[PDB]
């Protein structure tokens, strides 16, 4: 019953280029679906802090800019989560994990943890991020062919099971198609 979704290791560019879906239901969290149909709940980025953190006088909010090469994202913490902005400085190589949030139609990360990492960890991060992107795109390429031929039907769910494809992946492609059709109009 109590399930925690795992953080997906992604590039900053993929998070910025994705589509934020704010869940209206109380028992549903906010998720971002990237251009390659990847339903991501928590973000896991590794980059360099380009500017000195902005800490308020009354310690109500703390924000800092993170740059991994692909993009620059904002990392925010409020009230007690301001302690995360104090740990970092301008020039630190850190790993940030948190929930994806959208403020004024701009993507940003609500910090849950941030810590300094070794330069070899940044190399490792690029290896894992590239690897997971290859794995997901190859699975979604086959699932795209099943969705373009049958759609979301009882017959298509059996064919996807035989090809090593999860049922949720087909529903994410349909959700992405609906978002893209709204943008065309």
């Amino acid at each position: 019953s109590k399930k925690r979704m795992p953080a997906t290791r992604l590039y900053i560019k993929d998070i910025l280029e994705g589509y934020f879906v704010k869940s209206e239901g109380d028992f549903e969290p906010n998720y971002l679906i990237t251009k390659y149909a990847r339903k991501v709940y928590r973000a896991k980025i590794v980059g360099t802090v380009v500017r000195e953190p902005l800490i308020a006088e009354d310690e109500t909010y703390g924000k800092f800019q993170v740059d991994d090469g692909t993009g620059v994202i904002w990392v925010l913490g409020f009230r007690d989560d301001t302690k995360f902005a104090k740990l970092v400085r301008k020039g630190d190589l850190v790993q940030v994990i948190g929930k994806i949030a959208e403020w004024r139609d701009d993507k940003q990360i609500l910090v849950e943890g941030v810590s300094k990492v070794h330069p070899n960890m940044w190399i490792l991060h690029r290896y894992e991020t590239l690897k997971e992107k290859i794995e997901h795109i190859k699975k979604a390429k086959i699932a795209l062919e099943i969705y373009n031929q049958y759609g979301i039907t009882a017959k298509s769910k059996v064919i996807a099971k035989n090809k090593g494809i999860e049922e949720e992946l087909l529903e994410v492609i349909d959700e992405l198609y609906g978002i893209m059709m709204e943008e065309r109009s």
């Binding site: 360099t48 330069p119 190399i123």
Partner: protein
Amino acid sequence: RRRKPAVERKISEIREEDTRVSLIGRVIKVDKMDYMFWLDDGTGVAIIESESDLPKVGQVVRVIGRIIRNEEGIHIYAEVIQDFSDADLEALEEIRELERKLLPRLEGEIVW
């Protein structure tokens, strides 16, 4: 208009269109009077004008900064200088080649 990302490039691969670059190399000479240090990554040598933080000669560092293109020449105004002495440069070069060949291919695979 969002702040431009540090385009990770080599010293030989510096395109005129680049504004902010990520150069990873070894320091070969340090001038404390003019606050500038020479960086060598294996493809070329560039002058790095630092604000106040001056690294040691021989220390491998990662420098993120703005390209200063003027009548004086082409140098890098340092903003961030990280310690890459304990970094596996062979692994860094291997993932650079993997990203150069796979990332542009993966970008256009799922586009509708």
